[PDB]
Amino acid sequence: YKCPYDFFADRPGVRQCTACPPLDLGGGNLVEQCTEDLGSQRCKPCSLLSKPKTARTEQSPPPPSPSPPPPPPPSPRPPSPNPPSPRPPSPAPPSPN
């Protein structure tokens, strides 16, 4: 996105735009600086800008769309297998003679 008005970015690939700091003229007096147009890295003083703040004719961009939802918890595990069923009865010993 372009840096908005009164914001500038110099180093490329910058995460967030930075506001123009006030310009200290010396002796403790500071004149704040306003960017001329969108996406500019030059902080011109607000008194000397060719285009006044009123002359800006850009519809302010829509606010951030909401952040996505969270990832569902780990689904449960399949039921554990059951033990081997009981062995069948053993054969009765041979009947007497």
Residue closer to ligand GLA, measured from CB, 26 or 70: 70
Q: Computed over its alpha carbons, how large is the radius of gyration of the chain?
A: 38
Q: Using the rule CB under 6 A, is 54 a contact of ligand GLA?
A: no
Q: What is the DSSP letter of 45?
A: B
The answer to whether 20 and 35 have CB atoms below 8 angstroms apart is yes
37 forms part of the interface with ligand GLA (CB under 6 A): no
Instruction: Name the token pair of 72.
Output: 């569902």
Nearest-angstrom CA–CA distance, 60 and 2: 12
Q: Is 63 annotated as a binding residue?
A: yes
Residue 75 interacting with ligand GLA (CB under 6 A): yes
Show binding-site residues for alpha-D-galactose.
58, 60, 63, 65-67, 73, 75, 77-78, 80, 84-86, 88-90, 93, 95
